[PDB]
Amino acid sequence: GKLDLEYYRWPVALPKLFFTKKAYKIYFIILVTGLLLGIKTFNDAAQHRCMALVECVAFLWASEAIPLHITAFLVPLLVVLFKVLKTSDGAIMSAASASSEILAAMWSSTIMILLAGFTLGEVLAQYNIAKVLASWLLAFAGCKPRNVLLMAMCVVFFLSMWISNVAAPVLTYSLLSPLLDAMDADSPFAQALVLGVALAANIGGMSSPISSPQNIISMSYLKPYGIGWGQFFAVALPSGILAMLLVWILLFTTFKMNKTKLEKFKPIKTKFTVKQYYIITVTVATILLWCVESQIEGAFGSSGQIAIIPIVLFFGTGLLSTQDLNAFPWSIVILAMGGIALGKAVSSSGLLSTIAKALQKKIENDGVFAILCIFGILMLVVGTFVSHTVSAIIIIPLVQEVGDKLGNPKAAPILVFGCALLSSCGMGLASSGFPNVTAISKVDRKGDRYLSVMTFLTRGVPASILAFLCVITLGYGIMASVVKG
Protein backbone atom coordinates (compact mmCIF):
# COMPACT_ATOMS: atom_id res chain seq x y z
CA GLY A 1 0.00 0.00 0.00
CA LYS A 2 3.06 2.25 -0.10
CA LEU A 3 2.61 5.01 -2.69
CA ASP A 4 6.32 5.84 -3.00
CA LEU A 5 9.03 4.73 -5.41
CA GLU A 6 12.82 4.80 -5.36
CA TYR A 7 14.82 6.63 -8.02
CA TYR A 8 18.37 6.54 -9.33
CA ARG A 9 18.37 10.38 -9.52
CA TRP A 10 20.77 12.00 -12.02
CA PRO A 11 22.66 8.74 -12.84
CA VAL A 12 17.53 12.59 -15.61
CA ALA A 13 15.52 10.54 -13.10
CA LEU A 14 14.93 6.85 -13.75
CA PRO A 15 13.28 4.58 -11.17
CA LYS A 16 15.21 1.61 -9.76
CA LEU A 17 12.68 -1.04 -10.88
CA PHE A 18 14.28 -0.97 -14.34
CA PHE A 19 17.68 -2.14 -13.05
CA THR A 20 16.78 -5.12 -10.86
CA LYS A 21 17.36 -8.79 -11.64
CA LYS A 22 13.67 -9.28 -12.49
CA ALA A 23 13.85 -6.42 -14.99
CA TYR A 24 16.95 -8.00 -16.53
CA LYS A 25 15.17 -11.36 -16.81
CA ILE A 26 12.22 -9.70 -18.54
CA TYR A 27 14.54 -7.81 -20.90
CA PHE A 28 16.30 -11.06 -21.83
CA ILE A 29 13.01 -12.92 -22.33
CA ILE A 30 11.62 -10.22 -24.62
CA LEU A 31 14.93 -10.16 -26.51
CA VAL A 32 14.93 -13.93 -27.06
CA THR A 33 11.24 -14.05 -28.01
CA GLY A 34 11.69 -11.24 -30.53
CA LEU A 35 14.76 -12.95 -31.97
CA LEU A 36 12.82 -16.21 -32.32
CA LEU A 37 9.88 -14.45 -33.98
CA GLY A 38 12.08 -12.43 -36.34
CA ILE A 39 14.33 -15.30 -37.42
CA LYS A 40 12.68 -17.86 -39.68
CA THR A 41 12.64 -21.21 -37.88
CA PHE A 42 9.64 -23.29 -38.97
CA ASN A 43 8.03 -23.43 -42.39
CA ASP A 44 4.56 -23.15 -40.84
CA ALA A 45 3.87 -19.66 -39.51
CA ALA A 46 1.68 -20.91 -36.65
CA GLN A 47 4.33 -23.42 -35.56
CA HIS A 48 7.03 -20.76 -35.96
CA ARG A 49 5.09 -18.46 -33.62
CA CYS A 50 4.26 -21.32 -31.23
CA MET A 51 7.98 -22.05 -30.85
CA ALA A 52 8.47 -18.46 -29.66
CA LEU A 53 5.41 -18.74 -27.41
CA VAL A 54 6.68 -21.97 -25.82
CA GLU A 55 10.14 -20.47 -25.30
CA CYS A 56 8.67 -17.30 -23.78
CA VAL A 57 6.40 -19.12 -21.34
CA ALA A 58 9.05 -21.71 -20.42
CA PHE A 59 11.67 -19.02 -19.76
CA LEU A 60 9.19 -16.94 -17.75
CA TRP A 61 8.34 -20.00 -15.64
CA ALA A 62 11.93 -21.23 -15.18
CA SER A 63 13.39 -17.83 -14.32
CA GLU A 64 10.32 -16.93 -12.21
CA ALA A 65 10.60 -13.28 -13.20
CA ILE A 66 6.88 -12.92 -12.43
CA PRO A 67 4.77 -15.19 -10.19
CA LEU A 68 4.16 -18.57 -11.78
CA HIS A 69 0.36 -18.28 -11.74
CA ILE A 70 0.62 -14.91 -13.50
CA THR A 71 2.44 -16.44 -16.46
CA ALA A 72 -0.44 -18.94 -16.43
CA PHE A 73 -2.86 -16.01 -16.78
CA LEU A 74 -0.60 -14.59 -19.51
CA VAL A 75 -0.57 -17.80 -21.60
CA PRO A 76 -4.11 -17.37 -23.06
CA LEU A 77 -3.42 -13.75 -24.01
CA LEU A 78 -0.30 -14.75 -25.95
CA VAL A 79 -2.12 -17.70 -27.54
CA VAL A 80 -4.43 -15.13 -29.13
CA LEU A 81 -1.72 -12.53 -29.83
CA PHE A 82 0.56 -15.20 -31.29
CA LYS A 83 -1.90 -16.58 -33.84
CA VAL A 84 -0.97 -20.20 -33.15
CA LEU A 85 -4.37 -21.92 -32.90
CA LYS A 86 -5.72 -23.47 -36.09
CA THR A 87 -9.06 -24.84 -37.22
CA SER A 88 -9.67 -28.45 -38.23
CA ASP A 89 -9.05 -27.51 -41.86
CA GLY A 90 -5.64 -26.16 -40.84
CA ALA A 91 -6.31 -22.43 -41.21
CA ILE A 92 -5.50 -19.84 -38.56
CA MET A 93 -8.42 -19.08 -36.27
CA SER A 94 -9.78 -15.57 -36.03
CA ALA A 95 -8.85 -13.88 -32.76
CA ALA A 96 -12.42 -14.19 -31.44
CA SER A 97 -12.60 -17.90 -32.29
CA ALA A 98 -9.12 -18.45 -30.84
CA SER A 99 -10.09 -16.63 -27.64
CA SER A 100 -13.28 -18.66 -27.20
CA GLU A 101 -11.36 -21.88 -27.93
CA ILE A 102 -8.49 -21.14 -25.53
CA LEU A 103 -10.65 -19.92 -22.63
CA ALA A 104 -12.77 -23.09 -22.88
CA ALA A 105 -9.78 -25.43 -22.51
CA MET A 106 -8.69 -24.13 -19.09
CA TRP A 107 -11.60 -25.51 -17.07
CA SER A 108 -11.43 -29.29 -17.37
CA SER A 109 -12.08 -32.53 -15.50
CA THR A 110 -8.72 -32.36 -13.71
CA ILE A 111 -9.56 -28.91 -12.31
CA MET A 112 -12.60 -30.56 -10.72
CA ILE A 113 -10.41 -33.40 -9.43
CA LEU A 114 -7.99 -30.89 -7.88
CA LEU A 115 -10.83 -28.95 -6.24
CA ALA A 116 -12.23 -32.21 -4.85
CA GLY A 117 -8.77 -33.03 -3.51
CA PHE A 118 -8.70 -29.64 -1.79
CA THR A 119 -12.15 -30.34 -0.32
CA LEU A 120 -11.14 -33.79 0.93
CA GLY A 121 -7.89 -32.54 2.44
CA GLU A 122 -9.59 -29.68 4.27
CA VAL A 123 -12.44 -31.87 5.53
CA LEU A 124 -10.02 -34.56 6.75
CA ALA A 125 -7.69 -32.09 8.47
CA GLN A 126 -10.45 -29.98 10.04
CA TYR A 127 -12.24 -32.94 11.66
CA ASN A 128 -9.14 -34.73 13.03
CA ILE A 129 -9.29 -37.73 10.68
CA ALA A 130 -5.94 -36.93 9.05
CA LYS A 131 -4.40 -36.40 12.49
CA VAL A 132 -5.57 -39.86 13.57
CA LEU A 133 -4.37 -41.51 10.35
CA ALA A 134 -0.98 -39.76 10.58
CA SER A 135 -0.38 -41.35 13.99
CA TRP A 136 -0.53 -44.91 12.60
CA LEU A 137 1.60 -44.11 9.55
CA LEU A 138 4.21 -42.18 11.54
CA ALA A 139 4.28 -44.98 14.13
CA PHE A 140 5.13 -47.50 11.40
CA ALA A 141 7.68 -45.16 9.80
CA GLY A 142 9.59 -44.68 13.05
CA CYS A 143 11.83 -41.85 14.25
CA LYS A 144 14.28 -41.75 11.32
CA PRO A 145 13.63 -38.86 8.91
CA ARG A 146 14.59 -40.98 5.89
CA ASN A 147 12.00 -43.59 6.92
CA VAL A 148 9.26 -40.96 7.28
CA LEU A 149 10.26 -39.72 3.83
CA LEU A 150 10.02 -43.27 2.47
CA MET A 151 6.57 -43.68 4.03
CA ALA A 152 5.35 -40.40 2.52
CA MET A 153 6.60 -41.26 -0.97
CA CYS A 154 5.11 -44.77 -0.70
CA VAL A 155 1.74 -43.37 0.40
CA VAL A 156 1.55 -40.83 -2.42
CA PHE A 157 2.79 -43.42 -4.94
CA PHE A 158 0.12 -45.92 -3.91
CA LEU A 159 -2.54 -43.19 -3.99
CA SER A 160 -1.46 -42.11 -7.48
CA MET A 161 -1.58 -45.73 -8.64
CA TRP A 162 -5.38 -45.82 -8.34
CA ILE A 163 -6.81 -42.28 -8.26
CA SER A 164 -4.03 -40.59 -10.34
CA ASN A 165 -1.65 -37.81 -9.27
CA VAL A 166 -4.08 -34.91 -9.71
CA ALA A 167 -5.46 -35.28 -6.17
CA ALA A 168 -3.08 -37.78 -4.55
CA PRO A 169 -0.41 -35.16 -3.62
CA VAL A 170 -3.07 -32.98 -1.97
CA LEU A 171 -4.36 -35.89 0.10
CA THR A 172 -0.83 -36.94 1.08
CA TYR A 173 -0.02 -33.37 2.15
CA SER A 174 -3.23 -33.38 4.20
CA LEU A 175 -2.12 -36.57 5.96
CA LEU A 176 1.33 -34.99 6.36
CA SER A 177 -0.14 -31.93 8.12
CA PRO A 178 0.55 -33.16 11.71
CA LEU A 179 4.26 -33.22 10.78
CA LEU A 180 4.57 -30.45 8.18
CA ASP A 181 2.56 -27.92 10.22
CA ALA A 182 5.26 -27.42 12.88
CA MET A 183 8.10 -27.24 10.33
CA ASP A 184 9.60 -23.99 9.07
CA ALA A 185 10.08 -23.35 5.36
CA ASP A 186 13.89 -23.41 5.66
CA SER A 187 13.90 -26.84 7.33
CA PRO A 188 15.79 -29.32 5.10
CA PHE A 189 13.49 -32.17 6.15
CA ALA A 190 10.30 -30.25 5.31
CA GLN A 191 11.68 -29.34 1.89
CA ALA A 192 12.67 -32.97 1.36
CA LEU A 193 9.17 -34.15 2.33
CA VAL A 194 7.39 -31.71 0.00
CA LEU A 195 9.74 -32.39 -2.93
CA GLY A 196 9.58 -36.13 -2.29
CA VAL A 197 5.80 -36.22 -2.33
CA ALA A 198 5.87 -34.24 -5.59
CA LEU A 199 8.45 -36.54 -7.21
CA ALA A 200 6.82 -39.75 -5.97
CA ALA A 201 3.44 -38.61 -7.30
CA ASN A 202 5.16 -37.92 -10.63
CA ILE A 203 6.63 -41.44 -10.61
CA GLY A 204 3.39 -43.06 -9.44
CA GLY A 205 1.53 -41.44 -12.31
CA MET A 206 3.08 -44.08 -14.59
CA SER A 207 2.55 -47.36 -12.71
CA SER A 208 -1.03 -48.58 -13.04
CA PRO A 209 -3.10 -48.61 -16.25
CA ILE A 210 -5.40 -46.00 -14.69
CA SER A 211 -2.76 -43.83 -13.03
CA SER A 212 -2.74 -41.11 -15.71
CA PRO A 213 -4.59 -40.18 -18.93
CA GLN A 214 -1.52 -41.17 -20.96
CA ASN A 215 -1.77 -44.66 -19.43
CA ILE A 216 -5.43 -45.18 -20.36
CA ILE A 217 -4.72 -43.79 -23.83
CA SER A 218 -1.70 -46.07 -24.14
CA MET A 219 -3.68 -49.14 -23.08
CA SER A 220 -6.21 -48.25 -25.78
CA TYR A 221 -3.45 -48.84 -28.36
CA LEU A 222 -1.82 -51.68 -26.42
CA LYS A 223 -4.92 -53.88 -26.08
CA PRO A 224 -4.81 -55.35 -29.65
CA TYR A 225 -1.28 -56.60 -28.91
CA GLY A 226 -2.59 -58.76 -26.06
CA ILE A 227 -1.20 -56.61 -23.24
CA GLY A 228 -3.50 -56.59 -20.22
CA TRP A 229 -3.50 -55.36 -16.63
CA GLY A 230 -1.08 -58.05 -15.43
CA GLN A 231 1.39 -57.52 -18.25
CA PHE A 232 1.21 -53.75 -17.75
CA PHE A 233 1.80 -54.10 -14.01
CA ALA A 234 4.71 -56.54 -14.33
CA VAL A 235 6.57 -53.92 -16.38
CA ALA A 236 5.43 -50.61 -14.90
CA LEU A 237 5.34 -51.37 -11.17
CA PRO A 238 8.96 -52.58 -10.75
CA SER A 239 10.15 -49.64 -12.85
CA GLY A 240 8.19 -47.14 -10.76
CA ILE A 241 9.25 -48.73 -7.48
CA LEU A 242 12.93 -48.70 -8.44
CA ALA A 243 12.69 -45.13 -9.73
CA MET A 244 10.97 -44.05 -6.51
CA LEU A 245 13.61 -45.77 -4.36
CA LEU A 246 16.44 -44.13 -6.33
CA VAL A 247 14.73 -40.73 -6.03
CA TRP A 248 14.31 -41.35 -2.28
CA ILE A 249 18.04 -42.07 -1.99
CA LEU A 250 18.76 -38.88 -3.95
CA LEU A 251 16.46 -36.93 -1.63
CA PHE A 252 17.91 -38.13 1.67
CA THR A 253 21.45 -37.76 0.29
CA THR A 254 21.18 -34.25 -1.20
CA PHE A 255 19.24 -32.83 1.77
CA LYS A 256 20.71 -32.36 5.26
CA MET A 257 17.67 -33.95 6.88
CA ASN A 258 19.22 -37.10 8.38
CA LYS A 259 20.34 -35.20 11.51
CA THR A 260 16.86 -34.27 12.74
CA LYS A 261 14.80 -35.02 15.85
CA LEU A 262 11.29 -36.28 15.10
CA GLU A 263 8.50 -36.38 17.66
CA LYS A 264 7.65 -39.89 18.78
CA PHE A 265 4.22 -40.77 17.40
CA LYS A 266 1.99 -43.07 19.45
CA PRO A 267 -1.04 -44.11 17.38
CA ILE A 268 -4.32 -42.41 18.29
CA LYS A 269 -6.90 -45.02 19.32
CA THR A 270 -9.99 -42.84 19.74
CA LYS A 271 -13.31 -43.95 18.28
CA PHE A 272 -14.75 -42.01 15.37
CA THR A 273 -18.14 -40.33 15.65
CA VAL A 274 -21.12 -40.39 13.31
CA LYS A 275 -19.97 -37.17 11.64
CA GLN A 276 -16.43 -38.52 11.28
CA TYR A 277 -17.81 -41.81 9.98
CA TYR A 278 -19.89 -39.90 7.41
CA ILE A 279 -16.79 -37.99 6.28
CA ILE A 280 -14.78 -41.23 6.06
CA THR A 281 -17.56 -42.96 4.11
CA VAL A 282 -17.84 -40.10 1.61
CA THR A 283 -14.05 -39.96 1.16
CA VAL A 284 -13.78 -43.73 0.66
CA ALA A 285 -16.71 -43.75 -1.77
CA THR A 286 -15.17 -40.91 -3.79
CA ILE A 287 -11.84 -42.74 -3.93
CA LEU A 288 -13.56 -45.98 -4.97
CA LEU A 289 -15.57 -44.21 -7.68
CA TRP A 290 -12.32 -42.69 -8.96
CA CYS A 291 -10.81 -46.20 -9.07
CA VAL A 292 -13.70 -47.72 -11.06
CA GLU A 293 -14.27 -44.66 -13.25
CA SER A 294 -14.05 -46.63 -16.52
CA GLN A 295 -16.93 -48.89 -15.42
CA ILE A 296 -19.22 -45.98 -14.49
CA GLU A 297 -18.19 -43.63 -17.30
CA GLY A 298 -21.45 -44.29 -19.16
CA ALA A 299 -23.23 -42.36 -16.40
CA PHE A 300 -20.67 -39.88 -15.03
CA GLY A 301 -18.47 -39.36 -18.09
CA SER A 302 -15.33 -38.30 -16.23
CA SER A 303 -13.64 -38.29 -12.85
CA GLY A 304 -14.30 -34.55 -12.72
CA GLN A 305 -18.03 -35.23 -12.49
CA ILE A 306 -17.38 -37.70 -9.66
CA ALA A 307 -15.23 -34.99 -8.04
CA ILE A 308 -18.34 -32.82 -7.65
CA ILE A 309 -19.99 -35.31 -5.26
CA PRO A 310 -17.63 -34.69 -2.29
CA ILE A 311 -17.81 -30.93 -2.91
CA VAL A 312 -21.62 -30.90 -2.77
CA LEU A 313 -21.76 -33.37 0.12
CA PHE A 314 -19.26 -31.48 2.30
CA PHE A 315 -20.01 -27.86 1.42
CA GLY A 316 -23.76 -28.40 1.04
CA THR A 317 -24.10 -30.10 4.42
CA GLY A 318 -22.33 -27.26 6.22
CA LEU A 319 -19.23 -29.27 7.12
CA LEU A 320 -17.21 -26.73 5.12
CA SER A 321 -18.05 -23.03 4.91
CA THR A 322 -17.72 -20.35 2.25
CA GLN A 323 -14.54 -19.08 3.92
CA ASP A 324 -13.10 -22.59 3.64
CA LEU A 325 -13.72 -22.52 -0.11
CA ASN A 326 -12.26 -19.02 -0.41
CA ALA A 327 -9.20 -20.34 1.47
CA PHE A 328 -8.49 -22.90 -1.25
CA PRO A 329 -5.15 -22.61 -3.09
CA TRP A 330 -6.52 -20.85 -6.17
CA SER A 331 -3.05 -19.95 -7.46
CA ILE A 332 -2.51 -23.69 -7.93
CA VAL A 333 -5.73 -23.84 -9.97
CA ILE A 334 -4.67 -20.88 -12.12
CA LEU A 335 -1.22 -22.40 -12.72
CA ALA A 336 -2.78 -25.73 -13.72
CA MET A 337 -5.18 -23.94 -16.09
CA GLY A 338 -2.24 -22.11 -17.67
CA GLY A 339 -0.39 -25.38 -18.19
CA ILE A 340 -3.47 -26.85 -19.85
CA ALA A 341 -3.82 -23.81 -22.11
CA LEU A 342 -0.16 -24.02 -23.15
CA GLY A 343 -0.54 -27.71 -23.96
CA LYS A 344 -3.66 -27.02 -26.00
CA ALA A 345 -1.86 -24.26 -27.92
CA VAL A 346 1.01 -26.65 -28.66
CA SER A 347 -1.41 -29.34 -29.86
CA SER A 348 -3.53 -27.03 -32.04
CA SER A 349 -0.51 -25.35 -33.64
CA GLY A 350 0.98 -28.67 -34.71
CA LEU A 351 4.39 -27.71 -33.32
CA LEU A 352 5.10 -30.91 -31.39
CA SER A 353 3.79 -33.12 -34.20
CA THR A 354 6.32 -31.59 -36.63
CA ILE A 355 9.19 -32.06 -34.17
CA ALA A 356 8.10 -35.67 -33.56
CA LYS A 357 7.78 -36.43 -37.29
CA ALA A 358 11.18 -34.86 -37.95
CA LEU A 359 12.63 -37.13 -35.26
CA GLN A 360 10.73 -40.05 -36.80
CA LYS A 361 12.39 -39.57 -40.19
CA LYS A 362 15.91 -39.95 -38.72
CA ILE A 363 15.80 -42.56 -35.94
CA GLU A 364 13.72 -44.98 -37.99
CA ASN A 365 15.39 -48.11 -39.45
CA ASP A 366 17.29 -48.16 -36.14
CA GLY A 367 16.96 -50.83 -33.48
CA VAL A 368 14.02 -50.95 -31.09
CA PHE A 369 16.20 -49.94 -28.14
CA ALA A 370 17.57 -46.84 -29.89
CA ILE A 371 14.15 -45.64 -31.13
CA LEU A 372 13.02 -46.11 -27.52
CA CYS A 373 15.84 -44.09 -25.93
CA ILE A 374 15.71 -41.23 -28.46
CA PHE A 375 11.94 -40.85 -28.24
CA GLY A 376 12.05 -41.16 -24.45
CA ILE A 377 14.62 -38.38 -24.34
CA LEU A 378 12.33 -36.31 -26.58
CA MET A 379 9.31 -36.74 -24.31
CA LEU A 380 11.57 -36.12 -21.29
CA VAL A 381 12.54 -32.74 -22.74
CA VAL A 382 9.00 -31.98 -23.98
CA GLY A 383 7.18 -33.39 -20.95
CA THR A 384 8.99 -31.10 -18.51
CA PHE A 385 7.66 -28.08 -20.44
CA VAL A 386 4.47 -29.39 -22.10
CA SER A 387 1.75 -31.49 -20.48
CA HIS A 388 2.43 -35.23 -20.54
CA THR A 389 -1.08 -35.96 -21.84
CA VAL A 390 -0.69 -33.79 -24.95
CA SER A 391 2.80 -35.14 -25.64
CA ALA A 392 1.59 -38.73 -25.30
CA ILE A 393 -1.46 -38.11 -27.51
CA ILE A 394 0.83 -36.74 -30.23
CA ILE A 395 3.71 -39.21 -29.92
CA ILE A 396 2.25 -42.63 -28.97
CA PRO A 397 0.40 -42.93 -32.32
CA LEU A 398 3.65 -42.11 -34.16
CA VAL A 399 5.91 -44.63 -32.40
CA GLN A 400 3.25 -47.21 -33.25
CA GLU A 401 3.73 -46.50 -36.96
CA VAL A 402 7.51 -46.52 -36.46
CA GLY A 403 7.30 -49.97 -34.87
CA ASP A 404 4.59 -51.30 -37.18
CA LYS A 405 7.14 -51.02 -39.99
CA LEU A 406 10.04 -52.72 -38.20
CA GLY A 407 10.81 -56.39 -38.70
CA ASN A 408 10.39 -57.23 -35.02
CA PRO A 409 6.80 -58.37 -34.29
CA LYS A 410 7.20 -57.22 -30.67
CA ALA A 411 8.55 -53.81 -31.70
CA ALA A 412 5.26 -51.88 -31.78
CA PRO A 413 3.98 -52.99 -28.34
CA ILE A 414 7.43 -52.41 -26.83
CA LEU A 415 7.63 -48.88 -28.26
CA VAL A 416 4.07 -47.96 -27.26
CA PHE A 417 4.58 -49.29 -23.71
CA GLY A 418 7.98 -47.62 -23.32
CA CYS A 419 6.81 -44.25 -24.61
CA ALA A 420 3.80 -44.52 -22.29
CA LEU A 421 6.14 -45.05 -19.34
CA LEU A 422 8.66 -42.41 -20.47
CA SER A 423 5.96 -39.79 -21.09
CA SER A 424 5.79 -39.17 -17.32
CA CYS A 425 9.52 -38.81 -16.58
CA GLY A 426 9.68 -35.07 -17.27
CA MET A 427 9.43 -33.60 -13.77
CA GLY A 428 12.23 -31.03 -13.62
CA LEU A 429 10.10 -27.89 -13.92
CA ALA A 430 7.99 -26.80 -10.94
CA SER A 431 5.33 -25.21 -13.17
CA SER A 432 4.34 -28.32 -15.14
CA GLY A 433 2.18 -31.12 -13.79
CA PHE A 434 -0.28 -31.21 -10.88
CA PRO A 435 2.16 -32.73 -8.32
CA ASN A 436 4.78 -30.10 -9.21
CA VAL A 437 2.34 -27.18 -9.19
CA THR A 438 0.97 -28.34 -5.82
CA ALA A 439 4.41 -28.63 -4.21
CA ILE A 440 5.80 -25.32 -5.49
CA SER A 441 2.87 -23.44 -3.90
CA LYS A 442 3.03 -25.05 -0.45
CA VAL A 443 3.71 -22.52 2.31
CA ASP A 444 4.65 -22.85 5.97
CA ARG A 445 2.78 -21.40 8.97
CA LYS A 446 4.44 -18.01 8.39
CA GLY A 447 3.58 -18.10 4.68
CA ASP A 448 7.01 -18.84 3.17
CA ARG A 449 7.19 -21.43 0.41
CA TYR A 450 9.16 -24.57 1.20
CA LEU A 451 10.50 -25.03 -2.35
CA SER A 452 11.85 -22.73 -5.04
CA VAL A 453 12.02 -23.39 -8.77
CA MET A 454 15.80 -23.78 -8.40
CA THR A 455 15.42 -26.66 -5.92
CA PHE A 456 13.01 -28.33 -8.34
CA LEU A 457 15.56 -27.92 -11.13
CA THR A 458 18.46 -29.21 -9.02
CA ARG A 459 16.67 -32.35 -7.79
CA GLY A 460 13.83 -33.14 -10.22
CA VAL A 461 16.10 -33.04 -13.28
CA PRO A 462 18.39 -35.70 -11.74
CA ALA A 463 15.15 -37.40 -10.63
CA SER A 464 14.00 -37.33 -14.27
CA ILE A 465 17.15 -39.06 -15.52
CA LEU A 466 16.76 -41.59 -12.69
CA ALA A 467 13.15 -42.31 -13.70
CA PHE A 468 14.26 -42.56 -17.34
CA LEU A 469 17.13 -45.02 -16.81
CA CYS A 470 14.85 -47.24 -14.71
CA VAL A 471 12.42 -47.62 -17.63
CA ILE A 472 14.94 -48.35 -20.42
CA THR A 473 16.94 -50.81 -18.29
CA LEU A 474 14.52 -52.57 -15.93
CA GLY A 475 11.32 -51.89 -17.84
CA TYR A 476 12.83 -52.87 -21.18
CA GLY A 477 14.26 -56.03 -19.63
CA ILE A 478 10.82 -56.99 -18.36
CA MET A 479 9.22 -56.18 -21.74
CA ALA A 480 11.77 -58.42 -23.47
CA SER A 481 9.98 -61.43 -21.93
CA VAL A 482 6.50 -60.16 -20.92
CA VAL A 483 5.70 -58.77 -24.38
CA LYS A 484 4.82 -61.66 -26.70
CA GLY A 485 3.81 -59.82 -29.88
**Site of interaction with a copy of itself (CB under 8 A):** 1-5, 15, 17, 66-67, 69-70, 73-74, 76-77, 80-81, 94-100, 103-109, 111-112, 126-128, 273-276, 297-302, 304-305, 308-309, 311-312, 315-317, 322-323, 325-331, 334, 337, 447
Q: Choose among 464, 435, 413, 479: nearest CA to 205.
A: 435
Q: Is residue 413 within 8 Å of residue 227, measured between CB atoms?
A: yes
Q: Does 33 bind ligand 3PH (CB under 6 A)?
A: yes
Residue 376 CA to residue 52 CA, distance in Å, equals 24
Residue 359 CA to residue 100 CA, distance in Å, equals 33
Residue closer to a copy of itself (CB basis): 17 or 370: 17
Which entry of a copy of itself, Na ion, ligand 3PH, none binds 432, CB below 5 to 8 A by partner kind? Answer: Na ion
Candidates 56, 201, 243, 427; binder of ligand 3PH (CB under 6 A) is 56
Residue 34 CA to residue 46 CA, distance in Å, equals 15
Q: Does 444 bind ligand 3PH (CB under 6 A)?
A: no
Q: Does 34 bind ligand 3PH (CB under 6 A)?
A: yes
Candidates 432, 438, 441, 455; binder of Na ion (CB under 5 A) is 432
Least distance from C-beta 5 to a copy of itself, angstroms?
5
Q: Does 423 bind Na ion (CB under 5 A)?
A: yes
Residues 305-344 that bind ligand 3PH (CB under 6 A): 309, 312-313, 316-319
Q: Is residue 27 within 8 Å of residue 17, measured between CB atoms?
A: no
Classify the phi-psi angles of 9: left when phi > 0, otherwise alpha if psi is within -120 to 50, otherwise beta.
left
Helix segments in 64-212, DSSP class H: 68-81, 95-106, 109-126, 129-141, 145-163, 168-175, 177-180, 188-204
CA distances from 446 to 137, 169, 183, 327 (A): 26, 21, 10, 15
Which one of the spans 45-53, 96-104, 294-302, 423-431 is the region binding Na ion (CB under 5 A)?
Answer: 423-431
Q: Count CB atoms within 10 A of the CB of residue 257.
A: 21
Least distance from C-beta 372 to ligand 3PH, angstroms?
19
Residue 78 CA to residue 84 CA, distance in Å, equals 9
Residue closer to a copy of itself (CB basis): 305 or 354: 305
Q: 443 has which bridge partners?
A: 449
Residues 69-128 that bind ligand 3PH (CB under 6 A): 77, 81-83, 94
Helix segments in 292-350, DSSP class H: 297-300, 303-306, 308-315, 322-326, 330-349
Q: Does 3 bind ligand 3PH (CB under 6 A)?
A: no
Q: Is 20 buried (19+), middle (13-18) or exposed (0-12) by CB count in 10 A?
A: exposed
Residues 276-305 that bind ligand 3PH (CB under 6 A): 278, 281-282, 285, 296, 298-299
Per CB under 6 A, residues contacting ligand 3PH are 5, 17-18, 20, 22-23, 26-27, 29-30, 32-39, 41-44, 47, 49, 51, 54-56, 58, 77, 81-83, 94, 275, 278, 281-282, 285, 296, 298-299, 309, 312-313, 316-319, 354-355, 358, 381-382, 385
Per CB under 5 A, residues contacting Na ion are 206, 214, 384, 420, 423-424, 429, 432-433
